Amino acid sequence: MKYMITSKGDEKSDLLRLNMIAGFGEYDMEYDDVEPEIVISIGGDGTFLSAFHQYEERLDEIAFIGIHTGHLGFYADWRPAEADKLVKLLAKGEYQKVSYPLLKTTVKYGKEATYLALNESTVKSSGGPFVVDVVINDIHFERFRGDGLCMSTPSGTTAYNKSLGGALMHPSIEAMQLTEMASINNRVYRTIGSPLVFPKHHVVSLQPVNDKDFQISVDHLSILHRDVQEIRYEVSAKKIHFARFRSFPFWRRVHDSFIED
Amino acid sequence: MKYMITSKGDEKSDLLRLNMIAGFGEYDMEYDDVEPEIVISIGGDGTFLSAFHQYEERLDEIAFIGIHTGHLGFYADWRPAEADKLVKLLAKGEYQKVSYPLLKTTVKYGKEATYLALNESTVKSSGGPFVVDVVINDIHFERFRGDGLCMSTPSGTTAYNKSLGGALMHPSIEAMQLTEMASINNRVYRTIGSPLVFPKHHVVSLQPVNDKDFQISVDHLSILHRDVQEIRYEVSAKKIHFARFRSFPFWRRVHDSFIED
Amino acid sequence: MKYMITSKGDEKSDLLRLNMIAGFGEYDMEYDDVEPEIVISIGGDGTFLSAFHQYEERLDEIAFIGIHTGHLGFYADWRPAEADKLVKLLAKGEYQKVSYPLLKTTVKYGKEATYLALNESTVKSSGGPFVVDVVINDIHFERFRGDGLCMSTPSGTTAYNKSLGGALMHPSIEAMQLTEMASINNRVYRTIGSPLVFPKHHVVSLQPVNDKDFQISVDHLSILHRDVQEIRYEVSAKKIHFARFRSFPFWRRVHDSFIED
Amino acid sequence: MKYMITSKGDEKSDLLRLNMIAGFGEYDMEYDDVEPEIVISIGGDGTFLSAFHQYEERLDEIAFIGIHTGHLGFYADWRPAEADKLVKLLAKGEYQKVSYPLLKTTVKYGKEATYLALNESTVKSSGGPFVVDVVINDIHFERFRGDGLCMSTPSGTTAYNKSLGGALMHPSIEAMQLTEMASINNRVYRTIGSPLVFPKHHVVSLQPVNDKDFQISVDHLSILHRDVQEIRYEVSAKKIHFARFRSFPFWRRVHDSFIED
Ligand SMILES: NCCS(=O)(=O)NC[C@H]1O[C@@H](n2c(C#CCN(CC(=O)O)C[C@H]3O[C@@H](n4cnc5c(N)ncnc54)[C@H](O)[C@@H]3O)nc3c(N)ncnc32)[C@H](O)[C@@H]1O
Ligand SMILES: NCCS(=O)(=O)NC[C@H]1O[C@@H](n2c(C#CCN(CC(=O)O)C[C@H]3O[C@@H](n4cnc5c(N)ncnc54)[C@H](O)[C@@H]3O)nc3c(N)ncnc32)[C@H](O)[C@@H]1O
Ligand SMILES: NCCS(=O)(=O)NC[C@H]1O[C@@H](n2c(C#CCN(CC(=O)O)C[C@H]3O[C@@H](n4cnc5c(N)ncnc54)[C@H](O)[C@@H]3O)nc3c(N)ncnc32)[C@H](O)[C@@H]1O
Ligand SMILES: NCCS(=O)(=O)NC[C@H]1O[C@@H](n2c(C#CCN(CC(=O)O)C[C@H]3O[C@@H](n4cnc5c(N)ncnc54)[C@H](O)[C@@H]3O)nc3c(N)ncnc32)[C@H](O)[C@@H]1O
C-alpha cells in the first residue's frame, strides 16, 4: 500500500532509503508521505521518535518499522543488510501488528494543550527551585522538591526512566511510571523516593507551589511553558502499531541492548 | 456466616479478639476456624501474613480483614477503636470484595514443590557465592552473581522490594517484579541492574551454575532447599480477596505509611 | 573586634540583627562590613552561603557564625533564643576556630576564571546533550553522557551531593567527591556509576566533546559559560574558619538534620 | 632476601610458581615461608586476601605482590607473561613501597577478639531480623533495621562496598566507609541511607537491641558469633605495604577493572 521513508540524513541512511525506494518500485507499493500506511525510519531511535511525532495524528492507520544504521536502536530493530528482505516481506504483507501503550500529557493555563509521548514526559523548573504538589486521583500525595520528575511509557522505561533508577516493564502492561530527579529528603522535606507505576485510568496531576514557569519535555522536544496551572498525566487511549515480521521479544531486545549483542 | 479471628498473642490483641467474639455472639455469626468465610487478623502485617498462609487452600472462599494493634500495618487497615463498627458492618454484610494478585513459586529437584506468596519470594546462597542463570520465557537473559534475588507481588512492592530499590505498583496490575540484592558488575560480570516487571503468563526461571543448595524464602518462612534443579516464578491464577467497608485507596495507604499519617 | 551581620531580610531576621547590634554596642565590638573579623549570618543556609561569598577574599581573616531563624540550617548552628548568650561569649572571645576544606573550580576559555565553593560545583549542558571526557591527573578515565556532574566539598556532601547518592564525609578529611546525574549506560556507553572521592592535590579535568557551552553553578550561582575549553576541579588550599563556642559534632549535626531533632 | 609464593592451586598457577622459584634460585633469594620479607600471590584477589591473612602478624616486615592468572584482580596487578621481569627486578630490589590503610574490628562478649580486614567487615543476623543501634564516638546516631551493614577500607571500596552503592575512595585517604544493606524506611523506622565516610580515630560501635547472635565476616571468612555485646570499627594503626616496580595509578586500576581494559 502507501508507504514513506524518513532518513537520519547522513550519506549512509539516504542511500539506503534510495535503494529501498527503488526496490519498492517493483511492487504495488506507492510512495506517499501525506497519508502513508507504512512508515519506515532509517537512522537511530531519535529518527524513529521524529517519525512517530510527524504522524501522531494517524496512529490508528500506520504501522511503524525501524532500521538502525549505527548503534542498535531500541525501536529500530532491523539491520541495513536485511533491508532487501524487508522490502520483500513488506511488499507481500501478511505481517502481524504489535501495539505499545502511550502517555497523554495535558497542560492547563489561565486554556489547554495535550501531547503524546512514546518514551516519556518530564518537568523541570525554569531556573529557580522546582517545587510541585503531586495529586493522585484528586488526593494530595506529596510535595516534591528536587530537580524534576519523569513520567514514562512501558517502552520508555529503557530510556531516561532507566537512568533515574526506574524499573523496566514489558509493553503489554498498560501503565505509566513516575521517577524522581534528585529529590531532597530531610526532617522537613519528604518524598516517596521509589518509582511509582500507575494503571490505566489513574490521573497524576502536578500543581505549582510558587513559580508557575516550567520546562516541559515530550520525548525529544523541550519547551518552556509560562503561566502553567496544572500538568496532567494518564495512559493514553491511543496506541502505536509496529509491523513485526518475526519474533523479536522485548526481553531479548533488552538483553541485546544492555547485557551484550 | 462463618468467621475466625487470629491474634498476635499479646494481651492487647487477645482481649480485642475476645471482645469481638462476644460482639459477634449477638448476630447470626458462627465461629469456625476450619472452614471460615471471614478471617480477621489482629496484630501487624506478620500476623496477617500468617493468617493468609494458614488458609491458603481456601483463598477462593475467604475474604480477609486486618486490624493493626500497633504500628500501622499495610494489610491491616483497621484501628482497634473501630472494632465495634467492624463487627456491626461485618455482621450485616453487603460489603464489597477486592482482589490482589499473588506469586507462584515452583521448586524442582532430582520432584516438585509449589508455594504461594503474598509479599514476595527470595533466593540466596546456602553459604558460598550465589551464582544463577536467569531464563525468561526459555531465553537466557543474564548470569546473576550477588547476594540474591527477590520476586514481589504488587502489594509486596512496598515491603522487601521497596528496600531494594524496586518500584511501587498498584495492585490492579497483574504483574510480578524482580529486584537484585547487591550484584557485582565489572568488565567480566554483567547484570541488568534495573528492576524488571513481568506480566501474567511470563515465566522466570532460575538455574544453578555451581552450587545446588539455596535458602528460599516465601514471605516470612525461610527454608534451605537441597539438590535444587530450578526455581520458577509466575503470576498465580489465584487471588486473595479483602472485605472492604469503605474507600481506602492504595496510594493513600502508601501515603499514610511512608509520607506521614 | 570588628564584626558584621547579614540578614535574610524578613521581619524576623532584621529585628534579631538589630537586637544583636544593640547588644554588641555594650562592648568593645565595632561594626564594620568592609573588613570584619567576625561575620554573623541570620536566616538559613542560603543566607550563610551568601555571607561566605561576600567575603571570600578575606577567608583567612574571618570566622563565620550562623543563626537559623527557620528550618535548622546545616551551617547556621544557633537558635534565635540563644542570641544573647552568643553576643556575650563572642564579646568576651576566647572561642575555638574550626576549619573546613573548600573546592577550587577553574574554567578555561579561548583566558581563565577561578571560583571557590563551600557546598559544590556542578556542570550541565546549555540545552542539547551533555557529553564530557573525564581526565584524572592527565589520564582519560571515562566519557560521561548524562544530565551533568557534581563536585562536592566534605561539608557539601549533605546537600546536593546527598540527593544524588553520594556519601557523607566528615569535614576533617581534605577531599572532594564527584557524583553523576542520570548517566546513560548500555552496551555502547559506560561510566563508573559510583561516586568518586579524591584526595588533596588530585586534579579532575572535564573536557568538551562536541558542544562547548555549559551551565556551571558554584553553590547558589548558576551562569552559562561560552567557548569553554576545560573545567578543572581540585581541593583548595584555602579553608573557611568557624567560631565554635561548644561541641556540636558533625555526626550529631547530621543526626539532627536527617534522623530527627 | 627471604620470599615465599602462594598459589591458587590450579595447574596454571603452580607451574608459574615453580618457574618463578627456579628463576629465583639464580640470585641471593632464599625461600622462607615462616619469616618472608616478600610474599608473592599467584591467582586472583581471593588468593591475595588469603596471603595477607596468613601473614597479618608481620605486616610491618612484608611487602606484597600479586600476579593474576585469570580475571584481572584488583590487588594482583601483574600478568603471568611478565613474571620473569618480575623475578629480575625483584631480585635486584630498589623498588618503592606503597601503603594502604586497614580496618580494625573488635568484638566484645560476656572477653574480646580483634580482626584486621583488607577489603571490609560485615554484620548480618543469625536468622531472625537484624536490628542494631549505631553509636558514633559514643553518641547514638541511629537504629538500623535491615539485612546488615558493611564497613570498608579505601582499597575495599571497589569490592562489596561498591555493589551496595558506596563511593570509591583513593587509598591515600585514611578512612573507613559504612554502607547499608536493604534498610527499611517508613514513618516509624529511619536510617540515614547514605554511605558514611569516617576519618582516623573515629570509633563506630554497633550494639544489639534484641538478638545477641550475628554472622560477622572479615574479608572472605564468615563466622557466627554468639553472646555478642558490641562490635567496634576503627581505622587500624597498621598498614599493608605493596612492592611497586612502576606507576600503576589507582584510578587507572579502577578504569581497567570497570570501564574497560
Ligand atoms: N539528549 C539525548 C542524549 S542520549 O544520549 O540520551 N540519546 C538517546 C540514547 O537513548 C537511546 N534510546 C532512546 C532514544 C532516543 C532519542 N533521544 C535523542 C534525540 O531525540 O535525538 C531522546 C531521548 O533521550 C532520552 N534521554 C534524555 N536524557 C537522558 C539521560 N540522562 N539518560 C538516558 N536517556 C536520556 C529520553 O528518553 C529521550 O526520549 N529511546 C530508547 C528506549 N525507549 N529504550 C532504550 N534506549 C533508548 C538511543 O538509542 C540513544 O542511545
Ligand atoms: N524480617 C522482618 C523484619 S521487618 O522489619 O522487615 N518487619 C516487617 C515490616 O514490614 C512491614 N510490611 C510487611 C510485613 C511483614 C512481616 N514480616 C515479618 C514477619 O513475618 O514476622 C515479613 C516481611 O518482612 C519483609 N522484609 C524482610 N526483610 C526486609 C528488609 N530488609 N527490608 C524491608 N522489608 C523486609 C518481607 O517483605 C517479608 O515478607 N508487609 C508489607 C507490605 N506489603 N507493604 C509495606 N510494609 C509491609 C511490616 O508492617 C513491618 O513494619
Ligand atoms: N535550589 C535550592 C533549593 S533547595 O531546596 O535545595 N534549598 C537548600 C536546602 O538544602 C539545605 N542545605 C544547604 C543549602 C543551601 C542553599 N541553597 C539555596 C539558596 O542558595 O538559596 C543552595 C544549595 O541547594 C542545594 N541543592 C540544589 N539542588 C538540590 C537538589 N536537587 N537536592 C538537594 N539540594 C539541592 C545545593 O547544595 C546548593 O548549594 N547546604 C546544605 C549542606 N551543606 N548540608 C545540608 N543541607 C544543606 C538548606 O538548609 C535547604 O534546606
Ligand atoms: N563471595 C565472593 C563472590 S565474588 O563474585 O564477589 N568474588 C570476588 C570478586 O571481587 C573481586 N574483588 C575482590 C575480591 C575477592 C575475593 N572474594 C572471594 C574469595 O575470598 O574467595 C571475597 C570478597 O568478595 C567480595 N564480595 C562478597 N559479596 C559480594 C557482592 N555481593 N558483591 C561484590 N563483591 C562481593 C567482598 O569484598 C569479599 O572481600 N576484592 C576486590 C577489590 N578490593 N576491588 C575490586 N574487586 C575486588 C575479585 O577480583 C572477584 O572478581
Coordinates of N, CA, C and O and ligand atoms in Angstrom, one line a residue, chain B residues 45-46 49 72-75 119-120 155-160 163 219-220 258, chain D residues 128-129 145-147 181-184 186 189, ligand 2:
Chain B
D45 N 1.3 -6.8 60.2 CA 1.4 -7.5 58.9 C 1.9 -8.9 59.0 O 1.6 -9.8 58.2
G46 N 2.8 -9.2 60.0 CA 3.2 -10.5 60.2 C 2.1 -11.4 60.6 O 2.0 -12.6 60.2
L49 N 0.0 -12.0 57.4 CA 0.7 -13.0 56.6 C 0.5 -14.4 57.1 O 0.4 -15.4 56.3
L72 N 1.0 1.0 62.2 CA 0.0 0.8 61.1 C 0.6 -0.2 60.1 O 1.6 0.0 59.5
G73 N -0.1 -1.4 60.0 CA 0.3 -2.4 59.1 C -0.4 -2.2 57.7 O -1.5 -1.7 57.6
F74 N 0.4 -2.6 56.7 CA -0.1 -2.3 55.3 C -1.3 -3.1 54.9 O -2.2 -2.6 54.2
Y75 N -1.4 -4.3 55.3 CA -2.6 -5.1 55.1 C -3.7 -4.9 56.2 O -4.9 -5.1 55.9
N119 N 3.6 -11.3 49.8 CA 4.6 -10.3 49.6 C 5.6 -10.6 48.5 O 5.6 -9.9 47.5
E120 N 6.4 -11.6 48.7 CA 7.5 -11.9 47.8 C 8.1 -13.3 48.0 O 7.7 -14.0 49.0
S155 N 1.2 -6.0 45.8 CA 1.1 -5.5 47.1 C 2.3 -5.7 47.9 O 2.5 -5.1 49.0
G156 N 3.2 -6.6 47.5 CA 4.5 -6.7 48.1 C 5.5 -5.7 47.8 O 6.6 -5.6 48.4
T157 N 5.3 -4.8 46.8 CA 6.3 -3.9 46.4 C 6.6 -2.8 47.4 O 7.7 -2.3 47.4
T158 N 5.7 -2.6 48.4 CA 6.0 -1.7 49.5 C 6.8 -2.4 50.6 O 7.1 -1.7 51.6
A159 N 7.1 -3.7 50.5 CA 7.8 -4.3 51.6 C 9.3 -4.5 51.2 O 10.0 -3.5 51.0
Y160 N 9.8 -5.7 51.2 CA 11.2 -6.0 50.9 C 11.6 -5.4 49.6 O 12.7 -4.7 49.5
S163 N 12.8 -1.7 49.8 CA 14.1 -1.5 50.4 C 15.3 -1.9 49.4 O 16.4 -1.5 49.7
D219 N 7.5 -15.3 51.7 CA 7.0 -14.4 52.8 C 7.9 -14.5 54.0 O 9.1 -14.3 54.0
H220 N 7.3 -14.9 55.2 CA 8.1 -14.9 56.4 C 8.9 -16.2 56.6 O 9.8 -16.2 57.4
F258 N 4.3 6.0 54.5 CA 5.7 6.5 54.2 C 5.8 8.0 54.2 O 6.9 8.5 54.5
Chain D
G128 N 16.9 -14.5 62.4 CA 15.8 -13.6 62.5 C 16.1 -12.2 62.0 O 17.1 -12.0 61.2
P129 N 15.3 -11.2 62.4 CA 15.6 -9.8 61.9 C 16.9 -9.2 62.5 O 17.2 -9.5 63.7
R145 N 17.5 -1.1 61.0 CA 16.8 -2.3 60.8 C 16.9 -2.7 59.3 O 16.6 -1.9 58.4
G146 N 17.4 -3.9 59.0 CA 17.7 -4.2 57.6 C 18.4 -5.6 57.5 O 18.3 -6.4 58.4
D147 N 19.0 -5.8 56.4 CA 19.8 -7.0 56.1 C 21.1 -7.0 56.8 O 21.5 -8.1 57.3
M181 N 22.8 -2.4 54.0 CA 22.2 -3.5 53.1 C 20.7 -3.5 53.4 O 20.2 -4.0 54.4
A182 N 19.9 -3.0 52.4 CA 18.5 -3.1 52.4 C 17.8 -2.7 53.7 O 17.3 -3.4 54.5
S183 N 18.0 -1.4 54.0 CA 17.4 -0.8 55.2 C 15.9 -0.5 55.0 O 15.5 -0.1 53.9
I184 N 15.1 -0.8 56.0 CA 13.7 -0.4 55.9 C 13.5 1.0 56.4 O 14.1 1.5 57.3
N186 N 10.2 3.8 56.8 CA 8.9 4.2 56.8 C 8.7 5.3 57.8 O 9.6 5.9 58.3
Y189 N 10.4 3.8 61.1 CA 11.9 3.4 61.1 C 12.6 4.3 60.1 O 12.2 4.5 59.0
Ligands
LIG2 N1 12.4 -9.8 59.0 C1 11.2 -9.0 59.2 C2 11.8 -7.7 59.8 S1 10.9 -6.2 59.2 O1 11.4 -5.1 60.0 O2 11.1 -6.2 57.8 N2 9.3 -6.4 59.5 C3 8.3 -6.2 58.5 C4 7.9 -4.7 58.4 O3 7.4 -4.5 57.1 C5 6.1 -4.2 57.1 N3 5.4 -4.8 55.9 C6 5.1 -6.1 55.7 C7 5.5 -7.1 56.6 C8 5.7 -8.1 57.3 C9 6.1 -9.2 58.2 N4 7.5 -9.6 58.1 C10 8.0 -10.1 59.4 C11 7.2 -11.3 60.0 O4 6.6 -12.1 59.1 O5 7.1 -11.5 61.2 C12 7.9 -10.4 56.9 C13 8.3 -9.5 55.8 O6 9.4 -8.6 56.1 C14 9.8 -8.1 54.9 N5 11.3 -7.8 54.9 C15 12.3 -8.7 55.1 N6 13.5 -8.2 55.1 C16 13.3 -6.8 54.9 C17 14.1 -5.8 54.6 N7 15.5 -5.9 54.7 N8 13.6 -4.6 54.4 C18 12.2 -4.5 54.3 N9 11.3 -5.4 54.5 C19 11.9 -6.6 54.8 C20 9.4 -9.0 53.7 O7 8.6 -8.4 52.8 C21 8.7 -10.1 54.4 O8 7.5 -10.5 53.7 N10 4.5 -6.3 54.5 C22 4.4 -5.1 54.0 C23 3.9 -4.6 52.8 N11 3.3 -5.4 51.8 N12 4.0 -3.3 52.5 C24 4.5 -2.5 53.4 N13 5.0 -2.8 54.6 C25 4.9 -4.1 54.8 C26 5.5 -4.5 58.5 O9 4.4 -3.7 58.7 C27 6.7 -4.2 59.3 O10 6.9 -2.8 59.6

